Symmetry: C2
Subunit: 245 residues, 2 copies
């Protein structure tokens, strides 16, 4: 399984500061064994795809579930592919908990981005109260089944486990906490889809990944890479891409 | 009061078709006395501003309430200015009734957009059930107060009245129904803000405007223009811009 790291820039940047970040990544020595994709703000997607070297993919941070229509504020898979981006991040913690997107809506968005030929980074994760109630497994298998029910071809899907308590807080899951869930998730895929999909699907971890802690997390057997937020805007993003070296 | 027509393209278009539409508008005979702005998908805002003539304004279709942050999928006033757009549409009927944005949130967005120096087209409107119940005035005045209580400078605000039953349906409000609401909203503005604000603030109508009905609507005394949806994607949008000729 090729190591994967996505950088989600969230609502940050302008052309000058993102042009500078893109020049850094294009000049840097990035492992050819890592699949790198950057998720730009929708207003900067075209600029990003035109600037970035072709080996680095571009991801939209969100999309809607139909090609066109009266949905002011939304963009569709058709528009993302038009600009040349090849991925979309769906079901992220902020979309679910700050903007209230449901499992059913994230599921409809996944089926439609895949039909439209886009790759999907699909995010799952439990809240602090759920982790402490000991229902982490129940919660993430429920979100994963919502996504799975909408995936015909798993070869363009990357699952991202991002515990909500670990996003932007600085409280990173320990290597053993991230491994335990990745391994349970991969068994869920083995018994509910097939062993072939369990073995080939990348399951990445997100939630306060930094240059300083990425190598020990990357050493866990079922951690296939990372979804990186705040540190995707800093030069240390180059070290996270290179975590296995 | 300068006649204002805003075209909201909603989630429509690609670079070929919006490039065509833009070439048409740039070469058209557009009234010297009309203020035109096009509301483009976020992914094409930079494209749209590079291609449209400088006389035509560009509007974002939504924005969030702070300059930067962990808000995946959102864009800010700061990024909108960075691209050269001068306007944002806030509180449109789909943001309210499809995506659940409340009056409190729309009010916070208006304050923030204006604090960053963007003009705002703020939308309000009642549902068919509220019109049938006789409470149109109650609803448009509480949605306008939520906006008005958050406006420090009215120079940059354009109010848009878009009855929900008239959007996408072809059931346009009659001139007399439009004039009734626009006249009452201008009266609310005279007594809750000031007379000078009531006299210079444009109040535009949206909801199934077409090249066939725009002249009747535009001769009404308190209708200062239009917020066009579906017809903004067509050649007849030029006739709506020229609705007083």
């Amino acid at each position: 399984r090729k190591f994967f790291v996505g950088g989600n820039w969230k609502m940050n940047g302008d052309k000058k500061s993102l042009g500078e970040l893109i020049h850094t990544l294009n000049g840097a020595k990035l492992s050819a064994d890592t699949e790198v994709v950057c998720g730009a703000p929708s207003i900067y997607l075209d600029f990003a795809r035109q600037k970035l070297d072709a080996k680095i993919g571009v991801a939209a941070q969100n999309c809607y579930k139909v090609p066109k229509g009266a949905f002011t504020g939304e963009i569709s898979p058709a528009m993302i592919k038009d600009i040349g981006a090849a991925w979309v991040i769906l079901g992220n913690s902020e979309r679910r908990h700050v903007f209230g997107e449901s499992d059913e809506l994230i599921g409809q968005k996944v089926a439609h981005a895949l039909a439209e030929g886009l790759g999907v980074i699909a995010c799952i994760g439990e809240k602090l109260d759920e982790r402490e109630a000991g229902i982490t497994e129940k919660v993430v298998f429920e979100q994963t089944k919502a996504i799975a029910d909408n995936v015909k071809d798993w070869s363009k899907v990357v699952l991202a486990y991002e515990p909500v308590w670990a996003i932007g807080t600085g409280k990173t899951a320990t290597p053993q906490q991230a491994q335990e869930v990745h391994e349970k998730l991969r068994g869920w895929l083995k018994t509910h889809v097939s062993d072939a999909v369990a073995q080939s699907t990348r399951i990445i971890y997100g939630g306060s990944v930094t240059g300083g802690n990425c190598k020990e997390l990357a050493s866990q057997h079922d951690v296939d890479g990372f979804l990186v937020g705040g540190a995707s805007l800093k030069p240390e993003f180059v070290d996270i891409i290179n975590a296995k070296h």
